[PDB]
Amino acid sequence: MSHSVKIYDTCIGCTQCVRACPTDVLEMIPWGGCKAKQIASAPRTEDCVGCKRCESACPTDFLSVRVYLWHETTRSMGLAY
Amino acid sequence: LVDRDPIKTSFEQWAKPGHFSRTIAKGPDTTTWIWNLHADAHDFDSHTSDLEEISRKVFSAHFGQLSIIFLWLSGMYFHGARFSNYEAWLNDPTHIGPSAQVVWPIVGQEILNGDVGGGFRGIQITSGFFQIWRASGITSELQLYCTAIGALVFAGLMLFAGWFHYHKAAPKLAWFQDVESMLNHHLAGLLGLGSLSWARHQVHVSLPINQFLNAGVDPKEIPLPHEFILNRDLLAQLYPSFAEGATPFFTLNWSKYADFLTFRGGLDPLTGGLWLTDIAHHHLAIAILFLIAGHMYRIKDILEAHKGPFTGQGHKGLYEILTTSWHAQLSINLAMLGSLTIVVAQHMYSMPPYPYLATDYATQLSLFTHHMWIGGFLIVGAAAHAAIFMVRDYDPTTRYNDLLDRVLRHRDAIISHLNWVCIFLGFHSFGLYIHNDTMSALGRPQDMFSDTAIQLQPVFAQWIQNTHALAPGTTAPGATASTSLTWGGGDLVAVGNKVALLPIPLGTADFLVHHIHAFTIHVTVLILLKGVLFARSSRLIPDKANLGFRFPCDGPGRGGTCQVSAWDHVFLGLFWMYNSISVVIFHFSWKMQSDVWGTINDQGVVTHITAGNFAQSSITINGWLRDFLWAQASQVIQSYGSSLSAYGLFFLGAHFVWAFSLMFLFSGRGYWQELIESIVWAHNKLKVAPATQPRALSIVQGRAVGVTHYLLGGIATTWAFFLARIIAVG
Amino acid sequence: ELDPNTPSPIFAGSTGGLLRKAQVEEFYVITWESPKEQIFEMPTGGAAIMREGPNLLKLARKEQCLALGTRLRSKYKIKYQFYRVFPSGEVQYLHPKDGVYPEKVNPGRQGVGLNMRSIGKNVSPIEVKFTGKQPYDL
Amino acid sequence: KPTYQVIQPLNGDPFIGGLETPVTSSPLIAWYLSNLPAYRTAVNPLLRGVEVGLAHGFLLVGPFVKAGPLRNTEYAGAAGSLAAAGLVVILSMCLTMYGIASFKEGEPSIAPALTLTGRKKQPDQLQSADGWAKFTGGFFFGGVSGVTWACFLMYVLDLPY
Amino acid sequence: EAWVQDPFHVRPIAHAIWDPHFGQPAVEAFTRGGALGPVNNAYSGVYQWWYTIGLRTNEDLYTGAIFLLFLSF
Ligand code: CLA
Ligand code: CLA
Ligand SMILES: CC(=CC=C/C(C)=C/C=C/C=C(C)/C=C/C=C(C)/C=C/C1=C(C)CCCC1(C)C)/C=C/C1=C(C)CCCC1(C)C
Ligand SMILES: CC(=CC=C/C(C)=C/C=C/C=C(C)\C=C\C=C(C)\C=C\C1=C(C)CCCC1(C)C)/C=C/C1=C(C)CCCC1(C)C
Ligand SMILES: CCCCCCCCCCCCO[C@H]1O[C@H](CO)[C@@H](O[C@H]2O[C@H](CO)[C@@H](O)[C@H](O)[C@H]2O)[C@H](O)[C@H]1O
Ligand SMILES: CC1=C(C/C=C(\C)CCC[C@H](C)CCC[C@@H](C)CCCC(C)C)C(=O)c2ccccc2C1=O
Ligand code: SF4
Ligand code: SF4
C-alpha cells in the first residue's frame, strides 16, 4: 500500500522455502534473533507487479497477499503500453 | 518408490499411501488427490523422465479401445439380431421404422416401447445399422449372431495383445524410434487390403444379393450361406465370367459390355441409396492407390529440401522430434482425423452410400450431427495437444531456429490479423440479421435484406453448383444425373415412399448463415490459435512455463492475470465450438426440411415437412424461434405419454444439467471452502467429519466441471429436441 | 541502427519486445557473461546465440529481463546484470546498488513488516475516520 | 543487390518488432505515401487538410445515396449531399476535440524550407495544437465541399453490366 | 376526458412514440383508437389514482408539473 500484502510469517528463513517473484523482494535483513535470522516482509516494493507467487511457497501463516494495492502504476501492470 | 525396487519382489504394490510427485499424497490426509489420480492419470511429466515406456504404454492402452469398439458392436450386431426387427424390416422397408432396443416392463417402463414395424413393441433407432446391414449377401438373424461373436473373438485376443505388450517385457526405442516404414504398410495394405478386400465381398455376394432384392422375395427365397463359390454361374446375371479376356489388358473385344462398374452417379428408383454397380469400382480404384502408394519409401530428405527466401529454412529439419513427440504427432492427426470426419457429414446427406437413407430422414441426420460433433470435438483437442507440445515434450531446446521459431518470431502478429477478421465478420456476420428485426419490427421491407428486397432477383444459380450438375459433358464421360442429385441441373423422380434429395437452392438465407459460420469458425481458432501459440512465454507473463500448460491463473496482479494459460484457451474454445457445431446443425435440418424432405403424391406435387417457410423468415433470427425452436419442439413438449417420451422426459433434465453448469462456471472457490467449513464445523460437534480433509474444487477442476456439463447439458437438450421431430411426421 | 553498430546478443527479426512506450517513458535492459557460443531461449518468443561483447540485450520491461535466470540460471554463470535506462540518465540504479543475489546481508534498506500493530487480532477493523492528525500515513 | 536489402529486421536492431518485410518497406510502396504525412511533414498540416478532407470527401456518397435508408433516391437532394454533409461535420470536431490531446502552444511558420530537415526527433509529437487546427480546418473545407462534386457530378454511371 | 367516461379494458395511454425509424405502419395499431399519432398506454397505475382521488375534468385538469415542479425545485 501502495503495495500492501502481508506474507510475513515468523521464520523468514529462505532455504528450501521461497525466492520466486520478479525483482520485488530483496530481503535477508537479519532481525536481532529469529532462528535462521533473516526477517520482515519485503524491501523497497515500488518496482514490480502483483503476484502471490509471493507465498504460494514459504509461509505467511495467516493470509498471503494477492492484488491489494489499488493505487496502481503501470509499470505496475505490464501494460502501460 | 521404493518398496521395493528392484530385484526382490514380484510382491506387488497393494498398500502404502500414495504416488505421484514427491512430497506426494503425504501421510497427511486430503481429498483433492481423488480428482487428481483420475484427472491427469494419463499425462507424462511423471511415470519416468524418460520416453521409452510411455510409447510402450500408449501402444497398449491404445489396444483396449479396438477391443471395446469390439465388445461394443457386438452388442449392436447382437441386438440388431435376436431383438430382431431387421428380418421384419427388410422384406418390408418404406414401411417399418426400425428397432433393436426394448425395455423389460419394470416400474413405469413400457411407455418407451411403441409399435415399430414387423409387428412389435420397442424403442426406435437413428444409428443406421439395418442399413450397413443391407450388405448381408446372405440375410438371417442367428447369422448376425456369428458376425457378433466374430466380434467378441477380435477382443480377448485383440485385447490380449495388450497383455502381450506393456505387461510383457515390452519392445523399445528403435522399434518406433525407427519410424522409417510405418505408413509404408498401413496405407498400402489395409487402407489398401481393406477397400481391396472389401471389394472382394462387395460384388462377390452383396451386389447380386440386392441386385435381385430390389424387387421383392422374402430372404432364403434368395441367398444361401455358401452358394457364392466357383459357381460363377449366378455371377452370370451381373456380367461375364470374362468369356475371352484373360487378366485385363487389351486384345479384348466388346461388341456389347464393359465389366460390372459401368459407373452410375445417381439413385436407384426403388432404393435411392446410390448405385452399387459403382460401389465396387470406387473401392477398387482406391486400394490400387495405397497398393501403389504405401511403397515409399525407406526420411528427412523430402522436407530437408524445398526452402526459399521468407519461406521455412527450418522446413528443412521440420523435426527430428517428429519421431520424438507424440503430443505433437497426436495434435496433428486430431485436426485431420477430426477435420476429416465432418467432411463425411456432407458427402453423406448430399450423396447417400447405403440403401434406404434420405427417405429414412432421421436415420441419417442424427448421423450428420453425431458425425459433426467429432469433426469438432476432436479439433479443439487437436489444438489442446499442440499446446501440450508447445509447452513441454522434448528434453531441452534442441529443435532450433526454424519454421516455428519462425512463426513465433511473428506471434503478436498472425493473431493480430485474424482478430480484426472477426469483428469485420460479426458486424457483417450477425448484426446483419439484427438489421432485419430492427427494421422489419420497424417494418419497411423495401429495405430489409430479404431474398427479394435487397437486390438479388428470382435466381441464385449462376455460380458452380450449376457447373456441377451439368459437368457430365466435359472430359467427363457421364452417367445420368451428376454426382450428387442436390445440384442445380436436371432430374426429379427420386423415391416412392416419401422424398430424398433434389436441387437445394440458395441466395440469401443460405448466403449469410454460410457467413455466420465463417465468423463462428474464425473466432473459434483465434482463441485456440493465440492460445497454443503464446503457450510458454509472453509480455503479461514471461516466467510463464514454470509449471505446466494448465495452471489456474498466474495471480491477481498485472491487472487480471487469470485466464491466460491454454488449458483455458482450450476451455473457452470448447465454449465457442459448442456453438460452431450447435448452430451448423441448426442450419441443416431447418434447410433440409424447409426444403428437400417433404413429399411426393400425384403430379408429384411436392409438400415439404414445411412449404419453404425459410424463404423470408430465417433472415430475422426470431424466425429462428418463430419458425424453429417455438415451431418444431412443439413435438418435444407434446411428447409425454407416448413411446419416445424419453426425449421430452430428458429435455427437462439436461435442459437442467446445463442450467447447473453456470454454478460451476460462474463462481469463486475459497467460497465453497468458506462454506465447506460451516459444514465441517456442524460435522465435528456430533463427531462426524475431519479424516480425509474435505476440500473445495481445484480452481481449474471447477472449470472442468463447468464446460463438460455446459456441453452434456446444452447438447443432449437438442439430441432430444431432434429425435422427436423426425420420428413422427418428418 | 548502424552507423553506430555496437551489438552483442544475436537474434534477427521479431514482433516481440520494445515498442513506442520505451522512448516516451522508461527503458529497462539486461547484460551478462558467457563461455562458448551457445543457443538460448528468449523472452518474447524467438531464439538465438551469444559469444560476447558486453552481452547487452535491451528489454521492454524488467519482469521480462530477469527471466534470463528463471531459465538463464539453469545454464551456468555467476553474472547477469540489468539496469535502468531512461530517455536521459539515472536515479533508479537497478541491479547496480549494493552486493547482489537477494538472500545475503550487508544492509536493510526498506521493508519493515508490521504496520502499526502486528498480525495479531485485527478483528479490530478500521479505526479512526481518516483525519489529518493521527499516524496513519504508512 | 543482396538476398533482400543488406538483409535486416527493422532499420537495424532486431529488438523493436516491425519485422521489416515487404508490405512494410519495399521502395515499391514506401514511396506511394510521402508527399503526405508519412515519413516527413511536407508543408505544415494546413494544406494536406483538404486533399485529405476532399478525397475522403467525395467518398461517402453511393454509400449513403445508393445504400441510403430508403435507397435509390428520386429526390433532387440525394445522389449526393442530402445529409452526409453530416458525417464530415460529426467528425470535423470528432477531430478538434482530439487536438485537445495536443496543446503545446506556438507560431514558427516553417512550411518554407531551410536546411534539409529531419524534423529530427520528428517521431513522437512535435506537432502542436496550432497545426492540428489548420488541418482539421482543412478537413471541414474538404469534407463539406468534397461532398458536392460528388453530388454536382451528374452521374454517367457504369452499371451492373 | 375519455377513460373518465367509462374505463372499458381498451388501451389507455402514456405518451406519443416518435421514431424516424418507424415505417408507415405508423398507421397500424400503435396509433391506438381515440388519440392521433402512435402511443403506448398506462401500465403504471397512476391512471386509476390521479382518477381515483377524483381529479377529473380535461378543462378542470392540466395541473401536475405546475405544482409538483414548483415543488421539485
Ligand atoms: C487422440 C486422443 C486423445 C488422447 C489419446 C488423449 C490423451 C490425453 N489427454 Mg486429451 N484431449 C483430446 C483427445 C485425446 N486426449 C481431445 C479431443 C481434447 C479436446 C477436449 C482433449 C483435451 C485435453 C485436455 C484439456 C487435457 C488432456 C489431457 C490428456 C492426457 C490426460 C488423460 C487423462 O487423464 O484422461 C482424462 C479423462 C478423465 C479424467 C475422465 C473424465 C471424463 C469426464 C469429463 C466425462 C465426459 C462426459 C461424459 C458424457 C460422461 C460419461 C457419461 C456420464 C453422464 C455417465 C492424455 C495424455 C490432459 C493433460 O493434462 O495432459 C497431460 C489435459 O487435461 N486432453
Ligand atoms: C424502485 C422504484 C420505484 C419506482 C420507480 C416506483 C414507481 C411507482 N410506484 Mg412504487 N414503491 C417503491 C419503489 C418504486 N416505485 C417502494 C420501494 C415501495 C415500498 C415503500 C413502493 C410502494 C408503492 C405503493 C404502495 C404504490 C406504489 C405505486 C407506484 C406507482 C405510482 C407512481 C408514483 O410512485 O408517484 C409517486 C408520488 C409521489 C412521490 C407524490 C405523493 C407523495 C405524497 C404521499 C406526499 C405527501 C407529502 C405531503 C405534501 C405532506 C402534507 C403535509 C401537510 C399538507 C399536512 C409507480 C409505478 C402506487 C401504485 O399502486 O400504482 C398503481 C402505490 O400502490 N409504490
Ligand atoms: C491377413 C490378410 C489379410 C487381409 C485383409 C485385411 C487386413 C483387410 C482389412 C481391412 C480393413 C478395413 C476394411 C478397415 C475397416 C475400418 C473400419 C470398418 C472402421 C470404421 C470406422 C470409422 C469410419 C472411423 C472410426 C469408427 C469406425 C471403426 C466405425 C491376408 C494375408 C495373406 C497372406 C499373408 C497369405 C496369402 C493370402 C493373403 C490374404 C495375401
Ligand atoms: C433428482 C435426481 C436425478 C435428476 C436427474 C436430472 C434432473 C438430470 C440428469 C441428467 C443426467 C444425464 C443427462 C446423464 C446422461 C447421459 C447420457 C447418456 C447422455 C448421452 C449423450 C451422448 C451420447 C453425448 C451427448 C448427447 C447425449 C446427452 C444424448 C435424483 C435424485 C435422487 C434422490 C432423490 C436421492 C437419492 C439419489 C437419487 C435417486 C439420484
Ligand atoms: C415448389 C416450387 C415450384 C418451383 C419449381 C418448379 C419448376 C419445375 C416444375 C415442377 C418441378 C417438380 O418436378 C415434377 O414435375 C411433375 C409435377 O408437375 C411430375 O411429373 C411426373 O408425373 C407424370 C406421370 O407420368 C408426368 O407428368 C411426368 O412423366 C412425370 O415426370 C414429376 O413427378 C416431377 O418431375
Ligand atoms: C458449487 C461449486 C463448488 C462446490 C462443489 C462441490 C463441493 C462438489 C463436490 C461434491 C462431491 C462430489 C460430493 C462427493 C461425496 C460423495 C461421493 C460421498 C458419498 C458416496 C456416495 C455413496 C454418495 C466448488 O467447489 C467450486 C470450485 C471452483 C469453481 C466453482 C465451484 C462451484 O461452482
Ligand atoms: S515466511 Fe516467506 S519469505 Fe516470509 S520469512 Fe519465511 S519464507 Fe521468508
Ligand atoms: S508477491 Fe508481490 S511483491 Fe512479491 S513478487 Fe509477487 S508481486 Fe512482487
JSON list of N, CA, C and O in Angstrom, two decimals, chain E residues 6-40:
[
{"chain": "E", "resi": 6, "resn": "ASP", "atom": "N", "xyz": [-65.97, 6.12, -19.13]},
{"chain": "E", "resi": 6, "resn": "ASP", "atom": "CA", "xyz": [-66.11, 4.75, -18.62]},
{"chain": "E", "resi": 6, "resn": "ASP", "atom": "C", "xyz": [-64.94, 3.89, -19.20]},
{"chain": "E", "resi": 6, "resn": "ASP", "atom": "O", "xyz": [-64.73, 3.79, -20.43]},
{"chain": "E", "resi": 7, "resn": "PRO", "atom": "N", "xyz": [-64.11, 3.38, -18.27]},
{"chain": "E", "resi": 7, "resn": "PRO", "atom": "CA", "xyz": [-62.80, 2.82, -18.50]},
{"chain": "E", "resi": 7, "resn": "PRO", "atom": "C", "xyz": [-62.75, 1.34, -18.97]},
{"chain": "E", "resi": 7, "resn": "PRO", "atom": "O", "xyz": [-61.88, 0.57, -18.53]},
{"chain": "E", "resi": 8, "resn": "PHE", "atom": "N", "xyz": [-63.64, 0.97, -19.91]},
{"chain": "E", "resi": 8, "resn": "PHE", "atom": "CA", "xyz": [-63.70, -0.37, -20.53]},
{"chain": "E", "resi": 8, "resn": "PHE", "atom": "C", "xyz": [-62.34, -0.85, -21.09]},
{"chain": "E", "resi": 8, "resn": "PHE", "atom": "O", "xyz": [-61.81, -0.17, -22.00]},
{"chain": "E", "resi": 9, "resn": "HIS", "atom": "N", "xyz": [-61.82, -2.02, -20.62]},
{"chain": "E", "resi": 9, "resn": "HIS", "atom": "CA", "xyz": [-60.42, -2.56, -20.94]},
{"chain": "E", "resi": 9, "resn": "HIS", "atom": "C", "xyz": [-59.82, -2.40, -22.36]},
{"chain": "E", "resi": 9, "resn": "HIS", "atom": "O", "xyz": [-59.25, -3.34, -22.91]},
{"chain": "E", "resi": 10, "resn": "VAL", "atom": "N", "xyz": [-59.92, -1.20, -22.93]},
{"chain": "E", "resi": 10, "resn": "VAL", "atom": "CA", "xyz": [-59.31, -0.92, -24.23]},
{"chain": "E", "resi": 10, "resn": "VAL", "atom": "C", "xyz": [-58.31, 0.28, -24.19]},
{"chain": "E", "resi": 10, "resn": "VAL", "atom": "O", "xyz": [-58.69, 1.49, -24.29]},
{"chain": "E", "resi": 11, "resn": "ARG", "atom": "N", "xyz": [-57.04, -0.12, -23.95]},
{"chain": "E", "resi": 11, "resn": "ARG", "atom": "CA", "xyz": [-55.80, 0.61, -24.25]},
{"chain": "E", "resi": 11, "resn": "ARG", "atom": "C", "xyz": [-55.62, 2.10, -23.89]},
{"chain": "E", "resi": 11, "resn": "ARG", "atom": "O", "xyz": [-55.21, 2.85, -24.76]},
{"chain": "E", "resi": 12, "resn": "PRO", "atom": "N", "xyz": [-55.85, 2.54, -22.61]},
{"chain": "E", "resi": 12, "resn": "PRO", "atom": "CA", "xyz": [-55.37, 3.86, -22.10]},
{"chain": "E", "resi": 12, "resn": "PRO", "atom": "C", "xyz": [-54.26, 4.57, -22.92]},
{"chain": "E", "resi": 12, "resn": "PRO", "atom": "O", "xyz": [-54.30, 4.49, -24.14]},
{"chain": "E", "resi": 13, "resn": "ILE", "atom": "N", "xyz": [-53.33, 5.30, -22.26]},
{"chain": "E", "resi": 13, "resn": "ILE", "atom": "CA", "xyz": [-52.12, 5.98, -22.93]},
{"chain": "E", "resi": 13, "resn": "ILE", "atom": "C", "xyz": [-51.13, 6.70, -21.99]},
{"chain": "E", "resi": 13, "resn": "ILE", "atom": "O", "xyz": [-51.54, 7.48, -21.11]},
{"chain": "E", "resi": 14, "resn": "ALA", "atom": "N", "xyz": [-49.84, 6.43, -22.26]},
{"chain": "E", "resi": 14, "resn": "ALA", "atom": "CA", "xyz": [-48.70, 7.10, -21.59]},
{"chain": "E", "resi": 14, "resn": "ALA", "atom": "C", "xyz": [-48.30, 8.36, -22.34]},
{"chain": "E", "resi": 14, "resn": "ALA", "atom": "O", "xyz": [-48.54, 9.48, -21.86]},
{"chain": "E", "resi": 15, "resn": "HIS", "atom": "N", "xyz": [-47.70, 8.17, -23.52]},
{"chain": "E", "resi": 15, "resn": "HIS", "atom": "CA", "xyz": [-47.08, 9.25, -24.28]},
{"chain": "E", "resi": 15, "resn": "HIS", "atom": "C", "xyz": [-46.98, 8.86, -25.75]},
{"chain": "E", "resi": 15, "resn": "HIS", "atom": "O", "xyz": [-47.19, 7.70, -26.12]},
{"chain": "E", "resi": 16, "resn": "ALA", "atom": "N", "xyz": [-46.62, 9.85, -26.57]},
{"chain": "E", "resi": 16, "resn": "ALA", "atom": "CA", "xyz": [-46.58, 9.69, -28.03]},
{"chain": "E", "resi": 16, "resn": "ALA", "atom": "C", "xyz": [-45.22, 9.17, -28.52]},
{"chain": "E", "resi": 16, "resn": "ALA", "atom": "O", "xyz": [-44.17, 9.82, -28.41]},
{"chain": "E", "resi": 17, "resn": "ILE", "atom": "N", "xyz": [-45.22, 7.94, -29.02]},
{"chain": "E", "resi": 17, "resn": "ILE", "atom": "CA", "xyz": [-43.99, 7.40, -29.59]},
{"chain": "E", "resi": 17, "resn": "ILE", "atom": "C", "xyz": [-43.74, 8.07, -30.95]},
{"chain": "E", "resi": 17, "resn": "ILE", "atom": "O", "xyz": [-44.66, 8.22, -31.79]},
{"chain": "E", "resi": 18, "resn": "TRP", "atom": "N", "xyz": [-42.48, 8.51, -31.11]},
{"chain": "E", "resi": 18, "resn": "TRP", "atom": "CA", "xyz": [-41.99, 9.34, -32.22]},
{"chain": "E", "resi": 18, "resn": "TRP", "atom": "C", "xyz": [-40.55, 8.87, -32.66]},
{"chain": "E", "resi": 18, "resn": "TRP", "atom": "O", "xyz": [-39.56, 9.49, -32.26]},
{"chain": "E", "resi": 19, "resn": "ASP", "atom": "N", "xyz": [-40.41, 7.77, -33.43]},
{"chain": "E", "resi": 19, "resn": "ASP", "atom": "CA", "xyz": [-39.06, 7.48, -34.00]},
{"chain": "E", "resi": 19, "resn": "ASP", "atom": "C", "xyz": [-38.95, 7.39, -35.53]},
{"chain": "E", "resi": 19, "resn": "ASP", "atom": "O", "xyz": [-39.55, 6.48, -36.15]},
{"chain": "E", "resi": 20, "resn": "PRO", "atom": "N", "xyz": [-38.19, 8.34, -36.16]},
{"chain": "E", "resi": 20, "resn": "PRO", "atom": "CA", "xyz": [-37.91, 8.46, -37.61]},
{"chain": "E", "resi": 20, "resn": "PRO", "atom": "C", "xyz": [-37.68, 7.14, -38.30]},
{"chain": "E", "resi": 20, "resn": "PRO", "atom": "O", "xyz": [-37.80, 7.08, -39.52]},
{"chain": "E", "resi": 21, "resn": "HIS", "atom": "N", "xyz": [-37.34, 6.10, -37.51]},
{"chain": "E", "resi": 21, "resn": "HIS", "atom": "CA", "xyz": [-37.08, 4.71, -37.99]},
{"chain": "E", "resi": 21, "resn": "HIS", "atom": "C", "xyz": [-38.39, 3.96, -38.27]},
{"chain": "E", "resi": 21, "resn": "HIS", "atom": "O", "xyz": [-38.43, 3.06, -39.13]},
{"chain": "E", "resi": 22, "resn": "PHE", "atom": "N", "xyz": [-39.45, 4.34, -37.55]},
{"chain": "E", "resi": 22, "resn": "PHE", "atom": "CA", "xyz": [-40.76, 3.80, -37.82]},
{"chain": "E", "resi": 22, "resn": "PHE", "atom": "C", "xyz": [-41.12, 3.78, -39.33]},
{"chain": "E", "resi": 22, "resn": "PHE", "atom": "O", "xyz": [-40.91, 4.75, -40.07]},
{"chain": "E", "resi": 23, "resn": "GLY", "atom": "N", "xyz": [-41.67, 2.64, -39.77]},
{"chain": "E", "resi": 23, "resn": "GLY", "atom": "CA", "xyz": [-42.29, 2.56, -41.10]},
{"chain": "E", "resi": 23, "resn": "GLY", "atom": "C", "xyz": [-43.62, 3.31, -41.18]},
{"chain": "E", "resi": 23, "resn": "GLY", "atom": "O", "xyz": [-43.97, 4.04, -40.25]},
{"chain": "E", "resi": 24, "resn": "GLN", "atom": "N", "xyz": [-44.35, 3.14, -42.29]},
{"chain": "E", "resi": 24, "resn": "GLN", "atom": "CA", "xyz": [-45.65, 3.80, -42.41]},
{"chain": "E", "resi": 24, "resn": "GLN", "atom": "C", "xyz": [-46.73, 3.12, -41.56]},
{"chain": "E", "resi": 24, "resn": "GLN", "atom": "O", "xyz": [-47.64, 3.82, -41.05]},
{"chain": "E", "resi": 25, "resn": "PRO", "atom": "N", "xyz": [-46.68, 1.76, -41.47]},
{"chain": "E", "resi": 25, "resn": "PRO", "atom": "CA", "xyz": [-47.30, 1.08, -40.29]},
{"chain": "E", "resi": 25, "resn": "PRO", "atom": "C", "xyz": [-47.05, 1.82, -38.93]},
{"chain": "E", "resi": 25, "resn": "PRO", "atom": "O", "xyz": [-47.07, 1.21, -37.83]},
{"chain": "E", "resi": 26, "resn": "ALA", "atom": "N", "xyz": [-46.82, 3.14, -39.03]},
{"chain": "E", "resi": 26, "resn": "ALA", "atom": "CA", "xyz": [-47.21, 4.13, -38.01]},
{"chain": "E", "resi": 26, "resn": "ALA", "atom": "C", "xyz": [-48.73, 4.03, -37.85]},
{"chain": "E", "resi": 26, "resn": "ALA", "atom": "O", "xyz": [-49.26, 4.21, -36.74]},
{"chain": "E", "resi": 27, "resn": "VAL", "atom": "N", "xyz": [-49.41, 3.73, -38.98]},
{"chain": "E", "resi": 27, "resn": "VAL", "atom": "CA", "xyz": [-50.88, 3.69, -39.05]},
{"chain": "E", "resi": 27, "resn": "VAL", "atom": "C", "xyz": [-51.45, 2.51, -38.29]},
{"chain": "E", "resi": 27, "resn": "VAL", "atom": "O", "xyz": [-52.58, 2.61, -37.75]},
{"chain": "E", "resi": 28, "resn": "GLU", "atom": "N", "xyz": [-50.69, 1.39, -38.25]},
{"chain": "E", "resi": 28, "resn": "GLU", "atom": "CA", "xyz": [-51.17, 0.14, -37.61]},
{"chain": "E", "resi": 28, "resn": "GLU", "atom": "C", "xyz": [-51.15, 0.32, -36.11]},
{"chain": "E", "resi": 28, "resn": "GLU", "atom": "O", "xyz": [-50.17, 0.85, -35.57]},
{"chain": "E", "resi": 29, "resn": "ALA", "atom": "N", "xyz": [-52.25, -0.11, -35.47]},
{"chain": "E", "resi": 29, "resn": "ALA", "atom": "CA", "xyz": [-52.37, -0.15, -34.00]},
{"chain": "E", "resi": 29, "resn": "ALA", "atom": "C", "xyz": [-50.96, 0.03, -33.40]},
{"chain": "E", "resi": 29, "resn": "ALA", "atom": "O", "xyz": [-50.05, -0.75, -33.67]},
{"chain": "E", "resi": 30, "resn": "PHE", "atom": "N", "xyz": [-50.79, 1.07, -32.61]},
{"chain": "E", "resi": 30, "resn": "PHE", "atom": "CA", "xyz": [-49.50, 1.71, -32.50]},
{"chain": "E", "resi": 30, "resn": "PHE", "atom": "C", "xyz": [-49.87, 2.97, -33.27]},
{"chain": "E", "resi": 30, "resn": "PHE", "atom": "O", "xyz": [-49.43, 3.16, -34.42]},
{"chain": "E", "resi": 31, "resn": "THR", "atom": "N", "xyz": [-50.67, 3.83, -32.61]},
{"chain": "E", "resi": 31, "resn": "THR", "atom": "CA", "xyz": [-51.76, 4.60, -33.22]},
{"chain": "E", "resi": 31, "resn": "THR", "atom": "C", "xyz": [-52.93, 3.76, -32.69]},
{"chain": "E", "resi": 31, "resn": "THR", "atom": "O", "xyz": [-53.21, 2.68, -33.21]},
{"chain": "E", "resi": 32, "resn": "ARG", "atom": "N", "xyz": [-53.54, 4.23, -31.60]},
{"chain": "E", "resi": 32, "resn": "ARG", "atom": "CA", "xyz": [-54.46, 3.39, -30.84]},
{"chain": "E", "resi": 32, "resn": "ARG", "atom": "C", "xyz": [-55.79, 4.08, -30.53]},
{"chain": "E", "resi": 32, "resn": "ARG", "atom": "O", "xyz": [-56.02, 4.57, -29.39]},
{"chain": "E", "resi": 33, "resn": "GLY", "atom": "N", "xyz": [-56.65, 4.12, -31.56]},
{"chain": "E", "resi": 33, "resn": "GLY", "atom": "CA", "xyz": [-58.09, 4.43, -31.40]},
{"chain": "E", "resi": 33, "resn": "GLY", "atom": "C", "xyz": [-58.45, 5.91, -31.31]},
{"chain": "E", "resi": 33, "resn": "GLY", "atom": "O", "xyz": [-58.56, 6.60, -32.35]},
{"chain": "E", "resi": 34, "resn": "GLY", "atom": "N", "xyz": [-58.65, 6.38, -30.06]},
{"chain": "E", "resi": 34, "resn": "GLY", "atom": "CA", "xyz": [-59.01, 7.78, -29.75]},
{"chain": "E", "resi": 34, "resn": "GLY", "atom": "C", "xyz": [-58.02, 8.85, -30.21]},
{"chain": "E", "resi": 34, "resn": "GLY", "atom": "O", "xyz": [-58.36, 9.68, -31.07]},
{"chain": "E", "resi": 35, "resn": "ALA", "atom": "N", "xyz": [-56.79, 8.83, -29.65]},
{"chain": "E", "resi": 35, "resn": "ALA", "atom": "CA", "xyz": [-55.74, 9.82, -29.97]},
{"chain": "E", "resi": 35, "resn": "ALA", "atom": "C", "xyz": [-55.23, 9.71, -31.42]},
{"chain": "E", "resi": 35, "resn": "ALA", "atom": "O", "xyz": [-55.57, 8.75, -32.10]},
{"chain": "E", "resi": 36, "resn": "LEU", "atom": "N", "xyz": [-54.42, 10.67, -31.89]},
{"chain": "E", "resi": 36, "resn": "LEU", "atom": "CA", "xyz": [-53.91, 10.61, -33.29]},
{"chain": "E", "resi": 36, "resn": "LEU", "atom": "C", "xyz": [-52.62, 9.79, -33.43]},
{"chain": "E", "resi": 36, "resn": "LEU", "atom": "O", "xyz": [-52.69, 8.55, -33.46]},
{"chain": "E", "resi": 37, "resn": "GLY", "atom": "N", "xyz": [-51.46, 10.45, -33.50]},
{"chain": "E", "resi": 37, "resn": "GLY", "atom": "CA", "xyz": [-50.15, 9.79, -33.66]},
{"chain": "E", "resi": 37, "resn": "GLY", "atom": "C", "xyz": [-49.94, 8.71, -32.61]},
{"chain": "E", "resi": 37, "resn": "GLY", "atom": "O", "xyz": [-50.55, 8.77, -31.53]},
{"chain": "E", "resi": 38, "resn": "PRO", "atom": "N", "xyz": [-49.06, 7.72, -32.90]},
{"chain": "E", "resi": 38, "resn": "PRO", "atom": "CA", "xyz": [-48.91, 6.47, -32.12]},
{"chain": "E", "resi": 38, "resn": "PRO", "atom": "C", "xyz": [-48.53, 6.71, -30.66]},
{"chain": "E", "resi": 38, "resn": "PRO", "atom": "O", "xyz": [-48.04, 7.78, -30.32]},
{"chain": "E", "resi": 39, "resn": "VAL", "atom": "N", "xyz": [-48.73, 5.70, -29.81]},
{"chain": "E", "resi": 39, "resn": "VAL", "atom": "CA", "xyz": [-48.70, 5.90, -28.37]},
{"chain": "E", "resi": 39, "resn": "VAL", "atom": "C", "xyz": [-48.59, 4.53, -27.65]},
{"chain": "E", "resi": 39, "resn": "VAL", "atom": "O", "xyz": [-48.61, 3.50, -28.32]},
{"chain": "E", "resi": 40, "resn": "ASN", "atom": "N", "xyz": [-48.50, 4.49, -26.32]},
{"chain": "E", "resi": 40, "resn": "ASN", "atom": "CA", "xyz": [-48.25, 3.21, -25.64]},
{"chain": "E", "resi": 40, "resn": "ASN", "atom": "C", "xyz": [-48.99, 2.83, -24.32]},
{"chain": "E", "resi": 40, "resn": "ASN", "atom": "O", "xyz": [-48.76, 1.73, -23.78]}
]
